[model samples]
Target: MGARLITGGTVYTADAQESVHARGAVLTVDDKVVAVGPAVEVEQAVQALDPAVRAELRRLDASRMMVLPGFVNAHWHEMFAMGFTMRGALRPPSDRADQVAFMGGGGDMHQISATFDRFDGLIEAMTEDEARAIAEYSMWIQLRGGVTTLGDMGSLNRPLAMVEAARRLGMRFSASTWASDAVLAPDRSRFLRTRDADTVLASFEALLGAVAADPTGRIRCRPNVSYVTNMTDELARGMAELVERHDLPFATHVGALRNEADAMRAYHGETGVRRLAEAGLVDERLMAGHSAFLDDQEQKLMLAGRAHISHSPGKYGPSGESALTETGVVPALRRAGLDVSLSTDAAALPGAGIAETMRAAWQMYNEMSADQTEVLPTDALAMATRIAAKGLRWDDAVGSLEPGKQADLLLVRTDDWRYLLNPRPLESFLWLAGSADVDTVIVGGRTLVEGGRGVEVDEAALRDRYLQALRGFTTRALRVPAEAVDPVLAEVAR
Candidate 1:
């Protein structure tokens, strides 16, 4: 909507042509990259801003900061509350298929319903005036971390509260309605996938209407067939068709655990990846998360098909299994002809910041294969910025600090020793900088955060509300019976 000149900082341009610069400047005109290079370039970019705003730009100094495009969260499951992940030190998905089976058999609609009820219960139990207050409270923390854009994974948003929360917090979002039409039991997982053609079209149409009315493009209505998500075949296929028709992207949990894959074959006669392929569903538009249990072949198929991947290497440990191995989805999808983006499954999970997620991937990718060629430090940064925007099809406007590109950027404190030791080397610095070092973030030329504090809202008050809500939601979930989750879990088991 406007223009701004961000100069006097080390720049990670995020533009493919240039690498990270130790002392560089960036110039932005409107919502596009005008040019990015030496300090002189900043002068031209500043001239393009309105005369009134140019005065403000002249006094700013970012000498100790590192400027990069705003982070892109490729696979965020918004409106999704907490859930149980397999605990204990594990190796990979293959090591713990049985464990996930124990956690409610992938999922159960009845269980999901109960979970929602629990969320509602928590909100009702809270002293807050309205239900939306809880989400409103939590969303601020997300914004504080500079999550400018996200993908809401499940349709668990009750009565549109999730959508409303995302908007209120000033987040760019794509909503995934977890379309499912399945029943229960460990033996019947994947029995149902989604609605028939008529139902699928109607549901997506309604969702599109909601998105179109938003005007801000904050709500990007998208399609999703919950893999192992407790749905039916007719439903899954219909959803895929709908996705193709509307040219919207499709995202789902593919290989979260190994036992899940066993369940996939044993229950549905196909691996989740294979199932999608058999349906002729593999494509660039498909963004799969956590293929930790995938075998080599499944991994190859996803890469060859030009699909996208959301890598979460930090979510596992020694006693627990590695999700990447279990799902057969690797971080290399980015280099292997697929789009790879970063995410924070929730506030607690790693990959919350594109930079951190990129770091996790660097360690794991080299550790597992010793390929040595994967995940260079700058590449790690790109996964969240440039590569992530590529996944969302917003590369044209955001993700890079280039000329004429949207001035959607984050200002990180480089003076901190944590992210850098010697400016002479790039690897050393990237290996150390944590997300906390981020001191400021700007969206559309407006400084939403300065010196790591929020500018647009009452930060402390906002947080108090969300935390209270989580506690309330937890209490409410316990009260809802397991049967209520049947609709959500019917496909999880398979």
Candidate 2:
């Protein structure tokens, strides 16, 4: 473990104490930050950590780089989301999407219930290897865009394998433990099911316990209950208590879809936020995913609970339904005094990932507010890093390049034209930077990507593997055929 220093550039801590106008250096010692301040100060900090090591090799030449904390996407579906869906075939634009909706509905209603449904069948249809391969590719892609961490929901496969992949691949991952006491089958039928909570707990516990587990703020495997949707009162409460007992954080879909809010209101005779409060489900320990539709009252409740928001505009789907921009969730949450973080939802859209997400968020609120200052450059960086860590419950450990925190950060190159024009104003860097300008990325005191490819991993080979998995996964995705999809619509046509 040698020490390194990034100097000759501007460093934005995303910390309020630090000014966006401040230019400084950072020191890292073996997957951890030793100090971050003026060039001379950080230099001294590194020297104090390792006096014997060569003085020259420790410095990172960030001469014209706009240094900011790496972004952390709060909620992501690593394996479940379709990676290249943009280029892939569409589901007759409508019918195939319904089949996807139907299958997910099945898991929520039937298979999760432990009934004689296609739960196992669906799992069997899609090979685990294929799903993991796609997820692995997604991780690499995330790194390329300078994302330091992400939470993988839809956890049903081998826990150890996922953790091991994160450890081996150099991706900062937060694996969510997803469980439900019930599920829906292929036929929209419900069934009762209970997972071996003890074993599931032990499995992830053992995984984190086994590895070095730095995630160096890159990876955190948390036992997360997907949501209160389709959940009984008892199970929802149990999930809240389980998270507390495990000392682990969890996330659930909040007021994302209107139908969900409408259903819970009908069932409980109150707002879904009230029901969530009763179940002890809405609190600081929880990260609310999507949250596309919530009024000021519910938003305040979320803020009061110290709950973090994982807002992904793309997840509400394409067209008028997009969550963040179309629904006004991002700005609304920010206005409500809630700590909000951005997420990809692993839901691919025109602008996805760190740079594109920033672009999308900027386009959204700036247009709405008629001011470029609505989401400042550092604010975008914060939503991706510090704020996201809060949502993922890793703020104390990661997020910023503060001393004693894991060196879970990145070194962006500002030498390119994308980030060059306005080196004068670091605050407006987002308006200038692009995904292509990312030069080198370091997570946990070690560089995963340098000089155009990940440290040592062959992206070419990874892409090859990703494509193979995509082909097979596509077939599995289409398992629910045209005839079987939306029988109600089919009957109407007949």
Candidate 3:
């Protein structure tokens, strides 16, 4: 890669000083931000430092654009993207408490297991070769939406295949294999049997080892406890020790549901986060996801452990009965000096993108609390960028647009009519802009998306392959004819 200059844009560096420049430039040399500041100063310094590269440097016009750090999606499951969401919407209880009970209660986790079964059945219907094509389409959509770094949650039938997809698509991704013994039933219902602790740990180590050995270091593999409920105490402690021994971040789902907390209390005599903390499993290296259910004591333990919460506002808050309201996790967690990073959990839900998620969170929290000052657009944006970078332990490299940082940034097209009336571009961005407005995204000084499209992958072809996979799975699992779903698929392709 050669040196390139991105100039004439409003820059939101999200730096230590929270700097915003009206007319700024970023000079990238190969894969790093060599210089970033006012255009004149950066230009003069670039020319003085390396005249040849400067003269030969490709200049990208950022005029009428809002240049900001590319959004880091702290948590999301890419293996099965929008299809999971579509399936959920197609089936409904229209009741939150009942739904939560169904998922976590002792009465056989029926619906929950059924959900897992659908995914398992879907994968079985397609060839393992077809699995490689799964994430390429999803990643392109996310990249086009300004997500540079994405985390694909938990185990899939072909976890490595998904990892390979991200690598081919040039995405900075975190991958984890499911680290549990709970096997899905053939009928696509709940787990009927649990594996022994020793077996679970062995599998976890093997998965982690395989990911660690990969030559491409861009893909990060971590020890993951898919769900706390699914793990026994011995396995939980072992998993934590495994994470500590490896000195890598551990990912797990916790406190996302009231029934989950109830189930834990009956078994462990305490709720989720507290139980984990007492067992020495909750620590700074924990990338805890959701965590919308907590008490004062649980919150304090979480703060003391310095565990990072990967909060997905879109996953739980969109419905009128917002889970965050009763949990009060966002306001309480952030106020307690804990890091709250934003994630899509999965696409097709709300807050799938940083900008979209931020705006959704800001509005929902404000509406729930009736306090206008409770949260701001800046706070929301930080969760998606600098704050998220810290949680994922990648702050040193990509989060902010500092000189030494990787040039992972986005250029929002603000020349459009929706944003022109607002004098404050950043504010307008949070309030008005969607992921679609992200015109360009450069990661590691490599342009991945430009002119509102992918720089490397062919979007149309990618979507076609995605539809084929979805069609294969849905037609088999749902027992519906291809023609019945073809028209619906065509609409989404657009």
Candidate 4:
């Protein structure tokens, strides 16, 4: 792509200084940002470019808009179809204690198996085209919501297809496949059947190879095990080896629920982080999701290792399984100096965007905590952008709107009645604005969304294909009774 200039906007840099310019301009050459400052200064720099280059430059007018770094969703699952298929079928517990009891008392295995079947069965049954269709649509919705970069925690679909979807959509993404060797049985002593260590490791290696074969640096690969209870020592060792060899980021679901941690301690004689440390997997590259159940020692282990946390506050509430407010782990983690970033765990829930996550984080923490300043709007934005990028180990490339970073940004229109006379633009936007207000989204100097619509793909056709894929997968998923997927559940019923 040629040079492009975006001028006449209020820019929120989210940098170390947290700078905001009333009238700013951003200039990009190819896929990297070259200049960002007051509109006149950037305009002058653009004019100084080689005459031939200046002649070919494209300009995007951003009058009455707010230019901010596009959100870096560091931990996500491409499982919108599964979420949609199981909508309203699974109900959450009524309270925190009940939630813990349901998960820890062995009743969660049914829900876990049902969810696994939806994701795994869909992957096994869908063709490459179908996978791509669903993945693309899942990502497209996020892109339109101002997410330019994604760090997939682990997807149930084919990793290569997920990568392809991001590539075609002009989004920066890192992909991982689920790796798990065991599941907690109702008895809590014997583990039920999942994939074996060798099988899971093989799948992870395949994902690494697929990512390595891609020419576009936009796509990356990470090593991940679905859960601590789901992993064996052998799998952990293999994952540690991959992380060391590739210098890649490692992701896993840990400390999300008390029962899972308790189960780990009961079976392995240690907590989840301790087990990971025993395998040399607890390090800076580790990004633990939903780290709400860690004790004082686990927190210290995380702090000593300089590990990161991917907090999805939007996924927790009275209606959800996890209680983020009750735990207050995110606020505590931030105070303890661990990098806690914002993320939307999956698209299955309504309003699952980086922007929405930011709002939720701000609201939930402030409303519940006595320290109303626990999470500021600025802090929330940083979590979604700079902090999230650092957690993903991509801060050098795509986090802040600096001169050397990739040009990933959103232009949100602020001329509407909601934003009129707004003295505090950032706070107002976070409090009231949403994905619909985003008029343009640029990733790597390429405009993927303009005028609030995707430019690279036919929206209607993509939607239709996504629905068709979902329909087919739903048919396949419903055909297999829950008993067929997990026979242990059938025995429990018997």
lDDT of 4 by residue, 1-494 (tens): 88998888788888898778888899999888899989999999998999988999998888688899989999988875564333422334343434343334322643563355345555777788878988988888888899898988878678888998998898999888877676665555655656667777788788788778777669887878787777778888988987898789999988877466656766555778888888888889999998888788888889999999999887555235463754677678788899999998874534557887898988877887766588877788899999999999989898799999988999988888877887557787887887777789988887888899888889988877876666556556546344333332223322
lDDT tens digits, residue span 232-265, model 1: 4555676677777777777777776545665566
Show where candidate 1 strays beyond 4 Å: 1-3, 44-59, 79-131, 187-204, 325-335, 347-352, 371-373, 419-421, 424-430, 480-494
Weakest 10 consecutive residues, lDDT, candidate 2? 102-111
In order, candidate lDDTs are 0.60, 0.62, 0.72, 0.79
Tens digits of per-residue lDDT, candidate 3, 348-446, equal 333356677788788877887797666676667777888887878778787789888888899988887767866558788877778888888888888
TM-score of each: 0.80, 0.80, 0.87, 0.90
Candidate 2, superposed: residue stretches over 4 Å from native: 21-23, 44-50, 54-57, 80-87, 90-128, 155-158, 182-218, 266-271, 314-319, 325-330, 348-351, 424-429, 473-494
Alpha-carbon error at 303 in model 4, in Å? 0.7
Which candidate number would show the highest TM-score if scored against the true structure? 4
lDDT of 1: 0.60
- TM-score of model 2 (CA atoms): 0.80
lDDT of 2 at 274: 64
Stretches of candidate 4 off by over 4 Å are: 88-110, 113-122, 347-350, 480-494
Quick one: ranking by lDDT, best first? 4, 3, 2, 1
Superposing all C-alpha atoms, what RMSD in Å does each candidate have to the true structure?
Answer: 7.4, 6.9, 4.1, 5.9
Cα displacement (Å) at residue 456, model 1: 0.9
